[PDB]
């Protein structure tokens, strides 16, 4: 079995559009969404099919009222970051929070915060301590960490119950999650070869170009969505017009090895 | 179905020392608290327990190990105040408490 | 200062109605409604997250209740019933979720419901 992860994110702006919620918090596993809530709905709903189907409605009421209360303290925590940095207009707060279950069987943990989307807090659930970026921080994890029980309460979280989490939410969804889609991997000329990868999943594959057996001086696409829940991806590399090189693209996805050469 | 459970009631000597069993079935684990309530008063914190081993306070201790589902809590040195009764509590995963029944400690003087 | 619940006693006939007040003064956002059973551990009635819901506990029927500001959360009785004879406890903590967090109890209340 490959690596799992579930991640909860929460967002918060101060002075948001009229529009715009103030709060938003958004589970997933892997890449797929499973959780949403935010400041205008006030409901904490299923957003993937295999959750709804396997969590009954005593689930998400019990989760709503929890996220009306994290909602406001979220208010209250990112009130206080601003008054302290002395920061007019709008700003953003954000915490995310998760494990990650690893192939081999071994488990990891995280969680921080951030603000403005630049890191702020980050726990270390091993030293049972956090690590301010800067004083407004340093004031925060003076107080976290007179709460010893707080931070007690944190590692057996990440290390038991998310783990736990996990394991449920990759059974409900065993189809969509531990699946596998081989890619269609073809080249071609533009002057520069271009390797291009299409129609796999999970989104987790590797492309790289060999100049006759090292690997070269690449230039790397990005790993983008297609839509019907797989992934496209491409590795472009320019050609010396004034020597001869054998060119070959190594495609690794999911355990299978693939080589095109040209 | 979650299920915590403890003693009745328990008996012994000012001046002894007492160990309060507290054995617990949930779903999912976020911490196991204590409280005592004086008859007739308002229950009050005690400690909390989420992780391994034992904890001292003061007077009082109380342990945990989550492989067994067991808690207990230590008195030493039995004053006649320290009759009360003894509640044990735990998060469930849903981070709700489910109660123990109680235990009555009674000292004789 | 604390956790403050009022009346400490009522005795009540089948079919009566009764309002329990309970305000706090440590500014939590949590509050809650206990009933306290010999035998059975704390059962929760309703409970109040946070400043704007509430949402049903272990045993509502019979109860209702209302969260009227950050710090008063009061407990209704409709039509009184002879199994609601218990002592109810109002406690709160500052945020609910917090795996760390106690409970702040108030004094109690004793009600008994007679035919």
């Known amino acids: 079995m490959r690596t799992h992860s579930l991640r909860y994110f929460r967002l918060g702006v101060s002075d948001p559009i009229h529009g715009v919620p103030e709060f938003i918090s958004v589970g997933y596993v892997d890449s797929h969404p499973i959780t949403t809530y935010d400041s205008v709905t006030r409901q904490k709903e299923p957003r993937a099919p295999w959750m709804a189907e396997n969590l009954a409605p005593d689930h998400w009421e019990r989760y709503t009222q929890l996220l009306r209360g994290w909602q406001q303290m979220f208010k209250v925590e990112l009130k206080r970051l601003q008054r302290h940095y002395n920061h007019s207009g709008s700003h953003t707060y954000q915490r995310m929070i998760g494990c990650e279950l690893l192939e081999d069987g071994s488990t990891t943990g995280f969680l921080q915060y951030a603000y403005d989307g630049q890191d702020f807090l980050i726990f270390n659930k091993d030293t049972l301590s956090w690590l301010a970026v800067d004083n407004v921080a340093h004031t925060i994890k003076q107080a976290w960490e007179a709460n010893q029980h707080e931070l007690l309460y944190q590692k057996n979280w990440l290390e038991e119950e998310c783990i736990a989490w996990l394991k449920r939410f990759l059974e409900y969804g065993k189809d969509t999650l531990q699946r596998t889609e081989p890619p269609l991997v073809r080249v071609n000329r533009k002057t520069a070869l271009f390797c291009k990868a299409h129609g796999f999943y999970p989104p987790e594959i590797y492309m790289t170009w060999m100049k006759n057996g090292e690997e070269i001086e690449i230039d790397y696409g990005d790993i983008l969505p297609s839509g019907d829940g797989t992934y496209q991806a491409w590795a472009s590399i320019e050609l010396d017009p004034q020597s001869s090189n054998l060119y070959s693209c190594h495609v690794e996805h999911s355990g299978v090895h693939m080589v095109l050469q040209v | 179905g979650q299920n915590i459970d403890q003693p009745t009631e328990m008996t012994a000597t000012e001046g002894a020392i007492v160990q309060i069993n507290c054995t617990y079935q949930?779903?999912?684990?976020?911490?196991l608290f204590w409280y005592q309530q004086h008859a007739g008063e308002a229950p009050t914190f005690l400690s909390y327990?989420?992780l391994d081993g034992l904890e001292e306070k003061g007077r009082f201790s109380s342990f945990l190990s989550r492989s067994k589902g067991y808690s207990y809590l230590l008195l030493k040195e039995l004053q006649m105040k320290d009759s009360a009764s003894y509640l044990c509590?735990?998060?469930?995963?849903?981070?709700?408490?489910?109660w123990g029944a109680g235990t009555k400690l009674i000292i004789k003087p | 200062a604390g956790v403050t619940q009022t009346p400490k006693f009522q005795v009540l006939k089948t079919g009566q109605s009764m309002t329990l007040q309970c305000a706090q003064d440590?500014?939590?956002?949590?509050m809650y409604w206990y009933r306290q059973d010999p035998g059975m551990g704390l059962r929760l009635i309703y409970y109040?997250?946070?400043?704007?819901?509430?949402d049903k506990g272990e045993v509502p029927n019979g109860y209702n209740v209302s969260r009227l500001n950050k710090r008063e959360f009061s407990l209704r009785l409709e039509s009184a019933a002879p199994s609601q004879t218990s002592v109810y406890f109002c406690?709160?903590?500052?945020?609910?979720?917090?795996?760390?967090?106690?409970?702040?109890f108030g004094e109690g209340s004793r009600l008994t419901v007679l035919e």
């Open positions: 509590a735990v998060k469930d995963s849903n981070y709700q408490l489910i």
């Open positions: 949930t779903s999912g684990f976020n911490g």
């Open positions: 327990n989420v």
């Open positions: 440590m500014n939590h956002n949590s």
């Open positions: 109040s997250a946070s400043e704007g819901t509430t």
């Open positions: 406690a709160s903590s500052v945020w609910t979720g917090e795996g760390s967090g106690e409970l702040f």
